[PDB]
User: Fold Group XV phospholipase A2 from Homo sapiens.
Amino acid sequence: HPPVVLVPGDLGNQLEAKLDKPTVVHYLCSKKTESYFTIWLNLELLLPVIIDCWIDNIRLVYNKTSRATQFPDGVDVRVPGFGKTFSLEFLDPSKSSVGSYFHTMVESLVGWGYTRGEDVRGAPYDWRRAPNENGPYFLALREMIEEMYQLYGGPVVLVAHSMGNMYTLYFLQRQPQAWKDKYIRAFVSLGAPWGGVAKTLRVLASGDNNRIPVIGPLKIREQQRSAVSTSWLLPYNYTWSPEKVFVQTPTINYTLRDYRKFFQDIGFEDGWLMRQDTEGLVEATMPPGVQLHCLYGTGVPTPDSFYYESFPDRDPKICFGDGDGTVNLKSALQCQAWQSRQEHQVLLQELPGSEHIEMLANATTLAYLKRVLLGP
Ligand SMILES: *[P@@](=O)(CCCCCCCCCCC=C)OC(C)C
Ligand SMILES: *[C@@H]1O[C@H](CO)[C@@H](O)[C@H](O)[C@H]1NC(C)=O
Ligand SMILES: *[C@@H]1O[C@H](CO)[C@@H](O)[C@H](O)[C@H]1NC(C)=O
Ligand SMILES: *[C@@H]1O[C@H](CO)[C@@H](O)[C@H](O)[C@H]1NC(C)=O
Ligand SMILES: *[C@@H]1O[C@H](CO)[C@@H](O)[C@H](O)[C@H]1NC(C)=O
Assistant:
C-alpha cells in the first residue's frame, strides 16, 4: 500500500501558544506561560469573558508596511505534530468527540495496516495564514514526501479535506511535473472549496458564531477577520459569475468584483490588502498534474448569498444552494475543467447527502479511499 500524507482544512489541526504578554484584556487572562498550551481546540478558552483572552492570543496582526501577519506582542503560536497524525485526528487534546476530525479515517487506515507517524503522516499547518505565509511548511512537506518515498519504496497518496485541497493544489502547481510523476501517486480531494465559498462574505461582514452560539457574532468576527485564510477563500471568478450577488443590503450589492468596496463598507480595509496578497497564489486554470479523485457532497443546504436588512452589524437572511453545507456545489465544476487540461485521470465522485465534516468519518468515503490505496 502507498504511503499517505493527510492535509487538513481550516481549523483542522491543533495550535499551541506560549505567552510573555506586556498586558492582558482581563485580569483572569494569563500574562505568561513557561511552556506551550493548546490554544486550538480547547472549549474552556471559548466560554464568555475568557474568549476575550483567546481572541487576544489567536488573532493575527496585519502589518501594512511588511504586507505580512505577525502574532500579538509576547505571543508565540506553533503547529505540533508535523509528520504525525495526533494533531489532526483530535483538535482537542482531551480527545472529546467535539474535536474528532481525522481520527475515524486514521483508525480505518491503521486497520488496513498503516502505521501512525510512519507510512501515514499528517501535514498540519497554521491554517490562519494563506500559502504566501507558509513557505517553510511547503519545504517541510516536499522533504517529508521525498523521505516517505525513500523509506517505503513508492510514491505517496495526498488526502486533503476542505482548505487543505487549496494548500495541496498551491504546492503541486509549484513542483515540476517530473517531481510529481516520481513522488505523487494520487491526490484524494475531500470537500475542496475550489473558487472559494459564499460563507466567507458573512463571516467577514457580520461574524459567524454558528458553532459557538453562547458568544456574540460581532465578538468572534474580530478573530475571523484577522485570519488571512478567510479573505483567501472569498469567491473567485473562475468558479462564480462576476455578476453573482453574494451580499445584498438596502443600499448596495457586492459581487466578487466589489471586494474593495465591501472591505471599505464593513470597516476592515486590512481584508482588501489580504485579498490582494492571496488572490493570485493558486493559478486559476492550472490543474495539479496528478491522478485526482474529487469527492464532493451534494443535497445539503449550503449558504449561497446573504440579505442584510441592517449591514454589517446584524445577522443576514440566508439563501441556500446545493453542496455539503459549507462548500458550494459550483466548486466541483473546477475538477471537471481539469479533465481536459491534464493527462493524469480526474475522477469525480458525488457523495449525495454527505455533510462537509461528516464525510471524513463516512463509510462510503472510507470505502472509496480503501479502493484507491489497496487497489481492486
Ligand atoms: P475548509 O478548510 C473551507 C471552508 C471555508 C470557510 C471559511 C470560514 C472561516 C471560518 C472561521 C475563520 C477563522 C479562522 O473548512 C473547514 C474544514 C471548516
Ligand atoms: C511592521 O513591519 C516592519 C518590517 O518588518 C517593521 O518596521 C515594524 O516593526 C512592524 N510593525 C509593528 C507594529 O510591529
Ligand atoms: C478574475 O479575477 C482576477 C483576480 O482574482 C482578476 O484580476 C481578473 O481580471 C478577473 N477576470 C475577469 C473578471 O475577467
Ligand atoms: C442588487 O441587485 C438586486 C438583484 O441583483 C436588485 O433587486 C437590487 O435593487 C440591487 N440593490 C441595489 C441597492 O442596487
Ligand atoms: C455517508 O455518505 C453517503 C455517500 O453520499 C451518504 O449517502 C450517507 O447519507 C452518509 N451517511 C451519513 C450518516 O451521513
